Amino acid sequence: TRYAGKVVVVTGGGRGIGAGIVRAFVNSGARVVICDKDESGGRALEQELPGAVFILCDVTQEDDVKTLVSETIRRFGRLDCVVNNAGHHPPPQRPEETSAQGFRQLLELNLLGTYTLTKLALPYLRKSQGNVINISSLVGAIGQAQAVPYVATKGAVTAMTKALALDESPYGVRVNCISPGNIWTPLWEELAALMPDPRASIREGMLAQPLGRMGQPAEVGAAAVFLASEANFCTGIELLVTGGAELGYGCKDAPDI
Amino acid sequence: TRYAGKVVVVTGGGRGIGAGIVRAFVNSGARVVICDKDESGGRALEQELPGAVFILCDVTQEDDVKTLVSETIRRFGRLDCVVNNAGHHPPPQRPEETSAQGFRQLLELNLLGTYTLTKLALPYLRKSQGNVINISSLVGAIGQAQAVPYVATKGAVTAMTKALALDESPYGVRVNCISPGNIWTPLWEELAALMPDPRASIREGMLAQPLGRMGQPAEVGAAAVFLASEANFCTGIELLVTGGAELGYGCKDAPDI
Amino acid sequence: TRYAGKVVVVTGGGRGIGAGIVRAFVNSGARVVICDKDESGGRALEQELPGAVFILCDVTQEDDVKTLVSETIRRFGRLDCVVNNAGHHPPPQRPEETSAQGFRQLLELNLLGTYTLTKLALPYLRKSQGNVINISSLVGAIGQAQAVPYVATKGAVTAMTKALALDESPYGVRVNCISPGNIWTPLWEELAALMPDPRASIREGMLAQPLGRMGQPAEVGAAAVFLASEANFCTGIELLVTGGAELGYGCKDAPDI
Amino acid sequence: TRYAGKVVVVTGGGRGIGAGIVRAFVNSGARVVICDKDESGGRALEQELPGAVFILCDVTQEDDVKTLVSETIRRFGRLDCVVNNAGHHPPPQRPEETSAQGFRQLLELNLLGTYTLTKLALPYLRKSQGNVINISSLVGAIGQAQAVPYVATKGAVTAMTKALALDESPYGVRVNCISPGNIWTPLWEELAALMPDPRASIREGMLAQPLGRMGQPAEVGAAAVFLASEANFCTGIELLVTGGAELGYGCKDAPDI
Numbered sequence A, B, C, D: 001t002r003y004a005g006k007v008v009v010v011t012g013g014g015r016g017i018g019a020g021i022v023r024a025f026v027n028s029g030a031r032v033v034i035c036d037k038d039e040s041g042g043r044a045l046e047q048e049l050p051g052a053v054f055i056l057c058d059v060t061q062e063d064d065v066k067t068l069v070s071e072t073i074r075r076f077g078r079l080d081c082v083v084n085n086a087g088h089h090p091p092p093q094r095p096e097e098t099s100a101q102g103f104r105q106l107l108e109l110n111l112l113g114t115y116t117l118t119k120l121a122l123p124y125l126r127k128s129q130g131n132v133i134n135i136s137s138l139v140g141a142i143g144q145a146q147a148v149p150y151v152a153t154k155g156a157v158t159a160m161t162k163a164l165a166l167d168e169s170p171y172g173v174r175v176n177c178i179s180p181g182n183i184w185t186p187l188w189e190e191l192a193a194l195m196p197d198p199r200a201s202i203r204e205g206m207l208a209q210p211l212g213r214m215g216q217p218a219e220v221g222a223a224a225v226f227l228a229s230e231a232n233f234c235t236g237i238e239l240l241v242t243g244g245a246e247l248g249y250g251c252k253d254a255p256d257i
């Protein structure tokens, strides 16, 4: 009942963190529009969850996103929350192995897709005093090795969240982000499979957190439901869901030369 | 039902933010021990709320706190969450008007009282895989005018939260803090009444937030219930409940000389 | 003598902060290559300063930047420091008045131009154990009103600085950023002139800092010389040159509703 | 010549970081008063350095500090910069092994000694438009294992720096802090010697930084000279001298349970 009667759009909701967010909002009583560029996971989720429907939509295609918003309004009559979760982490890449072209393409997905849906949704969010939740990353704040383009995109998302929070505050629309750390998702599994020792990569990922495990999509989903439903004095915050990875010292002649 | 069967201790729970936290936990299904050095508010709250009882306890008195913990265990059989909310903001004081003695006394309340209860509670929190929630302040992070001792105490609380999170992570005990901004409480009203123009002080306090109002104890309480009940991958975080006060530029010859 | 024998490239060095950085490095004993897309300021600076030469270069044009690096090496035989200062702040723009196209173009200048020069310069910086200094902005960290695209670009620069610092640490190349606040430059003057009350805008900009004035290009330049010449244990830092604008509370029914 | 004609007080200047700060200021042309509770190192430094004199002073003793300030003024006629470096890190201690009494004593040194000298020095710093530099720690910001009291003291110092910066800004007195990471000092060597495997502890300390080494007192000293002499638009900043230790992920059933 915590978010009953509300309508939520989750991008990249077909698997991983996005699917966990979809489930959390359905369990809170909301109706959820699952947006994904891939049919497989999202179509099955729509069949599984009564309060959820699937709309095929690539967030990098402006006309897909326009139709996503117009269809949400046509079918459900209101829009209360947009969760900008669609995003990608490329394989580890040394800086000299990156390209400006690949950087631009990653910006299109991780940053501009979030910008585009938010812009198209804002007129409806103003009517409902709704809110925006962007899924950024801990690595936007602290950096990550072999990931210059990805880190840059997430630093942009977190900063953009604060700017938009300032601009939308007079209209009662809150804008927040969640910065997850290592969350066990199909992306994590796919990237690990490309590594020389996948099991050692997964173990290193678990041990990066003081809690000694990776996080779950359900845990990111609970943070999202909190931000939407019970955080009415929170705007422009970065909610860390990281297991403590940012805390303390870790493994990163004369001792000082 | 979100925190049903759990036992929570809230210090300074007789009024203000603490009372809002008490109410939020009772509404989540928890049994709550209200600790306060003053009888008036906490005794009335115990009569009002079925799931809440009042224990007179000054957090600066080690034997009061020992009895608080032993009585909680004797009466309820477990301890799941400690909310260290007791604290005070002195009237605005220029740095040359402060004293080392007054600074020490404020440290006793705002920092050492939180340390003492946490230490005595930790053996029980380990048995229940419980958690600690410290009420710090936004001003520990960004500073505040005419408040050198207070700001220092809250910077200490936020830092201590991270250190304790590291130490207790192997035992499954999470340690987090909430940093509120301007929250409308009896302390805020009392300090405003001492100002030359109380109404102008209250207006300035409301306008420090992009949201254009101060926060409510209930909003801090909802953040506390989230941290206790649904933030299982969060440890060592600082959850801002500030209305956006930290965002953007505000009012703080040649233009550059 | 503090940076004698070293070779520094400063982008956008023809006026404003960039020119202040050029002057600071020349005064430290370095030879400086002034890069700018506009001839006027940079050509005059080359005539004025013995240790400085001007190379016309638009950082958004990959071939301009390739020639900038090859000409620096051809003329001076080494490269020790790249200062990525070229950037632009658009006029204040409400979020619904921005466009994805304008956002992409601002990313090209503020983010990708910094990426491109850094990538082309890194092989030479590795040989000299040199360093990178990116000019970001305080608003990447705290947000700014009516500036969603700009804020996003600077959040990206600050994050990218940390990622690149991690990647280049094994090679002894440090990567840092400076985040200025309000600095009195021709850009500041030009934007103020577009405002309804330019003098009131300039006054508000001065009063956003506890120091009560805006900063000078020379002050950013001194921070840059420090990072290049005397900060050998600093990598991935964000050096704030803001006059305290981020500190404390400022101007951003019932008091809590 | 960068700080010629200026008078600087450095507490705990007899060895370690403090001695490095003393040397850096003497090399900049300043006259330096070395304060230390121990005679051995500081007396030798006074003999070694023409521009430096030694005054025996325990910063926890208010009358020692009063005499430190009055003697500095009597002997040199002005006071331009106070560097609050005196401090201590206890051996690693689990939270249940700490005491409120030991916590209070560490607060007396690490926090209140800095407060007391700053308060007594401020009337003279106002006359000279001087500045305060507090030596905090990276661990105040990110936490540290087995160090609850120490971390709390440094979180307090960093926060207090921001509060005092706000209060002293109208008088032209800047207040900044340096947060070092692992710096190779006699304290580091002494603590390592208490460990089961001292060499392994030292190696782990070096590898906590992406730069792969610990820092030097001279590097902290250069940051201090920058803050005093060339950072006229910096107030309330935390200057990280950490080798990148805060960046990126490090070493801190199902993968997510």
Ligand SMILES: NC(=O)c1ccc[n+]([C@@H]2O[C@H](COP(=O)([O-])OP(=O)(O)OC[C@H]3O[C@@H](n4cnc5c(N)ncnc54)[C@H](O)[C@@H]3O)[C@@H](O)[C@H]2O)c1
Binding pocket: A011, A012, A013, A014, A015, A016, A017, A018, A035, A036, A037, A038, A041, A057, A058, A059, A060, A085, A086, A087, A088, A089, A109, A113, A135, A136, A137, A138, A179, A180, A181, A182, A183, A184, A185, A186, A187, A188
């Ligand atoms: N997994 C982690 O450890 C982690 C950590 C921090 C942040 N994040 C962020 O969380 C988000 C989700 O990550 P994940 O691990 O669940 O990834 P994932 O690859 O498992 O799932 C991403 C989903 O988004 C969809 N998607 C991708 N591009 C899209 C597009 N153009 N339009 C619409 N949908 C699109 C995919 O089809 C997929 O269903 C991303 O923004 C990622 O950067 C993940």
Ligand SMILES: NC(=O)c1ccc[n+]([C@@H]2O[C@H](COP(=O)([O-])OP(=O)(O)OC[C@H]3O[C@@H](n4cnc5c(N)ncnc54)[C@H](O)[C@@H]3O)[C@@H](O)[C@H]2O)c1
Binding pocket: B011, B012, B013, B014, B015, B016, B017, B018, B035, B036, B037, B038, B041, B057, B058, B059, B060, B085, B086, B087, B088, B089, B109, B113, B135, B136, B137, B138, B179, B180, B181, B182, B183, B184, B185, B186, B187, B188
């Ligand atoms: N009100 C705000 O704007 C604000 C903002 C940020 C943080 N905070 C923090 O929130 C907490 C509560 O603030 P508030 O505004 O509700 O204050 P308040 O004065 O209205 O309520 C504080 C309560 O704590 C009790 N208390 C005080 N000293 C105690 C002691 N020694 N032992 C036990 N109980 C004690 C008081 O009797 C009172 O019931 C404090 O830690 C404060 O620093 C408040």
Ligand SMILES: NC(=O)c1ccc[n+]([C@@H]2O[C@H](COP(=O)([O-])OP(=O)(O)OC[C@H]3O[C@@H](n4cnc5c(N)ncnc54)[C@H](O)[C@@H]3O)[C@@H](O)[C@H]2O)c1
Binding pocket: C011, C012, C013, C014, C015, C016, C017, C018, C035, C036, C037, C038, C041, C057, C058, C059, C060, C085, C086, C087, C088, C089, C109, C113, C135, C136, C137, C138, C179, C180, C181, C182, C183, C184, C185, C186, C187, C188
């Ligand atoms: N002025 C401030 O208050 C302020 C505050 C924070 C950050 N900054 C940043 O500092 C930097 C300089 O700002 P400023 O105020 O000195 O601006 P400015 O407009 O006065 O000077 C910018 C210079 O960069 C040049 N430039 C622009 N586009 C270029 C391109 N494509 N290639 C090469 N040169 C190019 C311009 O011709 C000009 O000489 C920018 O990155 C800006 O975002 C400025």
Ligand SMILES: NC(=O)c1ccc[n+]([C@@H]2O[C@H](COP(=O)([O-])OP(=O)(O)OC[C@H]3O[C@@H](n4cnc5c(N)ncnc54)[C@H](O)[C@@H]3O)[C@@H](O)[C@H]2O)c1
Binding pocket: D011, D012, D013, D014, D015, D016, D017, D018, D035, D036, D037, D038, D041, D057, D058, D059, D060, D085, D086, D087, D088, D089, D109, D113, D135, D136, D137, D138, D179, D180, D181, D182, D183, D184, D185, D186, D187, D188
């Ligand atoms: N060494 C590190 O890795 C490190 C890292 C971060 C911060 N710090 C901080 O740097 C400062 C210096 O650390 P260090 O490693 O050089 O320590 P150190 O023990 O080697 O030197 C400290 C000096 O301060 C003096 N001192 C101690 N108590 C004093 C008192 N009451 N009055 C006057 N002088 C006193 C000591 O006699 C000694 O000369 C401390 O504040 C410490 O917390 C150190």
Ligand SMILES: O=C(c1ccc(F)c(O)c1)c1cccc(-c2ccc(O)c(O)c2)n1
Binding pocket: A089, A091, A092, A093, A136, A137, A138, A139, A144, A145, A146, A147, A180, A181, A182, A183, A187, A188, A189, A191, A192
């Ligand atoms: O998607 C990943 C991820 C991991 C952590 C994050 F905070 C994040 O935003 C994304 C992920 C998954 C698996 C491996 C990696 C990874 C491992 C080593 C690297 O050098 C790297 O750049 C990425 N990242």
Ligand SMILES: O=C(c1ccc(F)c(O)c1)c1cccc(-c2ccc(O)c(O)c2)n1
Binding pocket: B089, B091, B092, B093, B136, B137, B138, B139, B144, B145, B146, B147, B180, B181, B182, B183, B187, B188, B189, B191, B192
């Ligand atoms: O208790 C207060 C408070 C306000 C904001 C906080 F973040 C906080 O932790 C505490 C409060 C209430 C009313 C006025 C003030 C206040 C106003 C002006 C001042 O200069 C000051 O130091 C405090 N503080």
Ligand SMILES: O=C(c1ccc(F)c(O)c1)c1cccc(-c2ccc(O)c(O)c2)n1
Binding pocket: C089, C091, C092, C093, C136, C137, C138, C139, C144, C145, C146, C147, C180, C181, C182, C183, C187, C188, C189, C191, C192
């Ligand atoms: O270039 C400017 C600037 C100002 C501050 C910054 F930190 C920064 O990175 C850039 C600038 C100059 C003059 C006015 C403004 C400005 C004023 C009001 C605004 O709403 C806005 O978005 C920008 N910005």
Ligand SMILES: O=C(c1ccc(F)c(O)c1)c1cccc(-c2ccc(O)c(O)c2)n1
Binding pocket: D089, D091, D092, D093, D136, D137, D138, D139, D144, D145, D146, D147, D180, D181, D182, D183, D187, D188, D189, D191, D192
């Ligand atoms: O003084 C030390 C120190 C180290 C790093 C810091 F940032 C700092 O402020 C102080 C130091 C020196 C040698 C060992 C340790 C240390 C090692 C393991 C620990 O668990 C611990 O609490 C401290 N700290």
Ligand SMILES: OC[C@H]1O[C@@H](O)[C@H](O)[C@@H](O)[C@@H]1O
Binding pocket: A015, A016, A017, A184, A185, A186, A187, A189, A217
């Ligand atoms: O593929 C790795 C993990 O991805 C998550 O999104 C799923 O909830 C898990 O069932 C799965 O183990």
Ligand SMILES: OC[C@H]1O[C@@H](O)[C@H](O)[C@@H](O)[C@@H]1O
Binding pocket: B015, B016, B017, B184, B185, B186, B187, B189, B217
């Ligand atoms: O005293 C100011 C405010 O304090 C809060 O704790 C109460 O919930 C309000 O009823 C009251 O208006």
Ligand SMILES: OC[C@H]1O[C@@H](O)[C@H](O)[C@@H](O)[C@@H]1O
Binding pocket: C015, C016, C017, C184, C185, C186, C187, C189, C217
């Ligand atoms: O145009 C505003 C300011 O821009 C700065 O870059 C120049 O150094 C100043 O001479 C000028 O007053």
Ligand SMILES: OC[C@H]1O[C@@H](O)[C@H](O)[C@@H](O)[C@@H]1O
Binding pocket: D015, D016, D017, D184, D185, D186, D187, D189, D217
């Ligand atoms: O004792 C460890 C180190 O402490 C530093 O303060 C000294 O400058 C070094 O000579 C010494 O190796």
Ligand code: NA
Binding pocket: A045, A046, A047, A048, A049, A050, A051, A052, A053
């Ligand atoms: Na369905």
Ligand code: NA
Binding pocket: B045, B046, B047, B048, B049, B050, B051, B052, B053
């Ligand atoms: Na009751």
Ligand code: NA
Binding pocket: C045, C046, C047, C048, C049, C050, C051, C052, C053
């Ligand atoms: Na020249």
Ligand code: NA
Binding pocket: D045, D046, D047, D048, D049, D050, D051, D052, D053
């Ligand atoms: Na001497």
